[PDB]
């Protein structure tokens with residue numbers, strides 16, 4: 001039954017996420033290839049084609065850094081939607097109380113977002129806009145503070161995560177395991193969530209043993225990556241709060257504001 005469950009998780013991940021690691025590698029390796037954004041000129045060209053509405057305001061357009069942060073937030077919002085539908089494939093998740101489903105998604109979504117962002121990152125940049133742009137790591141580092149500090153730690157996480165050479169069948173179960181953490185603040189039925197976690201982690205452990213016979217420590221490596229992601233998200237929320245306090249034009253999407261609210 002456990003091999004079947006791993007396959008059901010994988011198929012739900014292929015169905016629910018617009019981007020997966022195979023589809024990202026096809027693009028990253030060179031009809032509508034991605035537009036390369038490496039400087040302000042190419043950012044502005046890409047925006048005029050790919051997010052025309054955001055730059056249709058003339059002198060009232062926001063600063064480039066704010067537009068970029070807005071685009072990242074739109075990606076997070078879309079990924080929340082995808083993750084919410086994916087979670088239904090996890091045994092036991094849809095049987096939880098509605099409020100526990102909300103709590104698990106609230107704390108898990110950004111950990112999952114940053115885990116999956118690795119699939120669209122290489123050491124030089126990241127795919128954006130449904131695979132139609134590639135923005136360079138150096139260009140993001142060149143932005144004015146604090147905005148140059150947003151993505152770089154996510155690239156740092158991703159380069160080491162990508163060196164584990166996981167595939168989509170692994171990542172789907174890793175994302176399911178992120179969502180099933182029984183220690184999230186405020187859960188009502190911890191016991192049932194712990195059992196749900198145990199089940200998915202069991203599926204993950206057996207799958208990794210099969211799919212990665214060459215790396216006997218891959219399971220504990222991934223347990224550590226889950227802890228690293230929790231710390232990455234805590235730090236990310238702190239930076240977002242700095243932006244909220246000091247950057248009046250950098251409007252936070254209400255869905256994301258709610259996710260952040262009372263989180264850490």
Ligand SMILES: CCCCCC#CCC#CCC#CCC#CCCCC(=O)O
Pocket residue numbers: 037046047050051067068069071072073075076077113117127128129133135150240256
């Ligand atoms: C025309 C396309 C222009 C591309 C502009 C760009 C770009 C860079 C990018 C990107 C994809 C992403 C993402 C998820 C995230 C995050 C953390 C921050 C948001 C949040 O706090 O939610």
